[PDB]
Amino acid sequence: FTGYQLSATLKGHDQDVRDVVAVDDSKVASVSRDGTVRLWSKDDQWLGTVVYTGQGFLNSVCYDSEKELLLFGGKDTMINGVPLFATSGEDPYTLIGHQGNVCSLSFQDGVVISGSWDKTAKVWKEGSLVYNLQAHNASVWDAKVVSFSENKFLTASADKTIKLWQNDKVIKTFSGIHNDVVRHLAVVDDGHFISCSNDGLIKLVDMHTGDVLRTYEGHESFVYCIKLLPNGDIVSCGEDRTVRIWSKENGSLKQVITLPAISIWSVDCMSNGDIIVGSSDNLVRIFSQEKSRWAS
């Protein structure tokens, strides 16, 4: 390992950046409480364009790589989609059904899965609601596909539990992982996931036994987002102004990146290993291990 260093600072949003996504190694997208979706493209420098504007806060984004749509949602309860060539002012693709803030979005293998403060996650295919995952007693902060072919899904909630679903039924509840709001999930494989929480912890969990296999300790506040890098390492971020990189296999805290923002809301990983970061200073940042891409 060698440390990540700042590659680019992407300025344009006027309020917090709440979610970021890699589109490809030359394109990233972000959404913000400013109500915009921005697509940033790298030529020599990164240039941002607004591909959608609305009044409602946007809190989640993902990328449907076959339709080449940026999907996004937030306070107005809708999930919309725009192409990579949309212009601000054009009406958006719409997934209707949530009754509260859409706080998470993910896409895998043709499946969109959304988490909401309406206390549900919803699973969508071909523009249509297939499963309503209704069971949690409080906001669903995250939802992920475990297996598209088995219709297995994983949700994380303010009710302090993680639930594994098959179809629209809960088949297992993990109530012993965190004693606080669960904020995010990353599926390692069919048999393991990582979760993070307002308790400041990230944990690797055996999906079959519910055993905590490893705890990654160090964040000093809430942990809002976790992702797996191409090499399997964990990237996390949160309320303590940090982005952190961990060895999934042995728990080592490989790097702490401290930023001048009160909250770091979101991270995502490019295929080339670069890390995209959305924060409360209204910036998107890209970090890289590759010196050829360092801002310095």
Side-chain angles (χ1 to χ4, degrees), residues 87-280:
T87 61
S88 62
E90 307 176 341
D91 304 322
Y93 187 77
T94 302
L95 300 176
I96 188 166
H98 278 297
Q99 301 303 325
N101 180 34
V102 183
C103 51
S104 76
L105 280 169
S106 192
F107 177 91
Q108 202 163 290
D109 298 311
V111 181
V112 180
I113 189 172
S114 54
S116 172
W117 290 357
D118 70 10
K119 312 182 185 154
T120 77
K122 283 172 171 45
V123 176
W124 320 78
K125 306 177 178 183
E126 290 163 6
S128 178
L129 180 61
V130 176
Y131 309 117
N132 182 34
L133 310 190
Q134 193 164 296
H136 283 290
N137 211 17
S139 295
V140 173
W141 276 109
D142 198 25
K144 293 295 205 280
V145 173
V146 173
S147 169
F148 87 92
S149 71
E150 298 183 70
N151 297 313
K152 285 181 170 177
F153 314 108
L154 199 68
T155 56
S157 174
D159 71 8
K160 309 187 290 180
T161 74
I162 295 138
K163 287 171 185 291
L164 172 67
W165 303 75
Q166 183 160 45
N167 291 333
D168 64 355
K169 303 186 177 46
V170 176
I171 60 168
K172 190 171 184 70
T173 298
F174 306 88
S175 68
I177 310 301
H178 297 103
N179 193 29
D180 206 337
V181 170
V182 193
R183 292 295 291 249
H184 222 70
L185 302 167
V187 178
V188 176
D189 56 33
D190 284 3
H192 304 84
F193 71 83
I194 57 166
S195 54
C196 69
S197 167
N198 283 8
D199 68 8
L201 302 173
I202 307 161
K203 300 191 189 190
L204 174 66
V205 184
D206 185 310
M207 189 110 91
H208 173 70
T209 63
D211 288 327
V212 170
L213 301 179
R214 189 157 298 103
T215 300
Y216 312 84
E217 182 159 22
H219 277 288
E220 307 154 288
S221 201
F222 311 143
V223 189
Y224 296 134
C225 188
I226 47 178
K227 295 288 161 69
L228 303 172
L229 288 162
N231 71 355
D233 286 351
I234 303 167
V235 62
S236 65
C237 69
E239 183 52 44
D240 68 359
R241 316 192 289 111
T242 72
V243 176
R244 299 182 186 227
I245 296 106
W246 316 77
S247 166
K248 175 266 201 191
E249 297 293 344
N250 72 44
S252 292
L253 176 49
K254 297 184 172 203
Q255 187 175 7
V256 177
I257 298 165
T258 301
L259 297 176
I262 62 178
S263 305
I264 318 305
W265 297 114
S266 182
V267 289
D268 202 37
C269 302
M270 256 166 268
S271 78
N272 63 9
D274 286 14
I275 295 169
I276 313 160
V277 185
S279 49
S280 60

Side-chain angles (χ1 to χ4, degrees), residues 9-25:
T9 304
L10 279 47
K11 182 177 185 181
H13 283 295
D14 297 319
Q15 298 291 339
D16 291 21
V17 179
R18 294 293 310 201
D19 210 7
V20 301
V21 64
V23 168
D24 63 40
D25 292 347

Side-chain angles (χ1 to χ4, degrees), residues 78-90:
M78 314 298 166
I79 298 159
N80 296 286
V82 296
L84 298 171
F85 49 75
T87 61
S88 62
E90 307 176 341

